[PDB]
Amino acid sequence: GSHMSKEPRDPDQLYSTLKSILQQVKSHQSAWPFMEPVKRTEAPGYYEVIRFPMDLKTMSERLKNRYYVSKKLFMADLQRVFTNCKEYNPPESEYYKCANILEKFFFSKIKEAGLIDK
Numbered sequence: 175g176s177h178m179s180k181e182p183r184d185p186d187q188l189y190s191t192l193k194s195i196l197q198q199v200k201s202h203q204s205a206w207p208f209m210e211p212v213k214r215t216e217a218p219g220y221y222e223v224i225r226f227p228m229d230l231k232t233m234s235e236r237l238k239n240r241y242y243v244s245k246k247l248f249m250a251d252l253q254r255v256f257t258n259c260k261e262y263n264p265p266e267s268e269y270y271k272c273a274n275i276l277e278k279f280f281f282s283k284i285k286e287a288g289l290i291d292k
């Protein structure tokens with residue numbers, strides 16, 4: 175294309191462009207802490223430090239029914255998983271580590287697919 179290329183635009187192209195990302199992030203090495211949603215008490219405080227508990231257990235599931243078909247929409251979700259993990263997980267646990275790793279891959283991935291609502 176010419177200029178303004180970074181953009182999913184077509185809601186049919188983004189359906190898979192988002193799918194591939196969520197699929198790679200899951201297979202990635204920093205996605206095991208987000209696959210299963212943490213328990214309500216298993217965490218030091220997930221019912222407060224995190225007002226929007228969002229993990230990978232809902233992303234693909236919602237994408238299965240094209241529930242996620244927008245830039246800031248999917249971005250915010252995954253971006254919510256990394257920030258959420260770093261939110262409850264203090265600067266001294268594996269959750270923060272992988273959160274920074276996956277977030278790195280994710281960003282580079284969305285930057286390539288032409289997503290990133292920022």
Ligand SMILES: Cc1ccc(NCCCN)c([N+](=O)[O-])c1
Binds near residue numbers: 216268
């Ligand atoms: C706070 C907390 C709660 C639970 C878990 N375990 C994974 C929770 C979904 N199986 C972790 N963690 O670092 O794996 C942290």
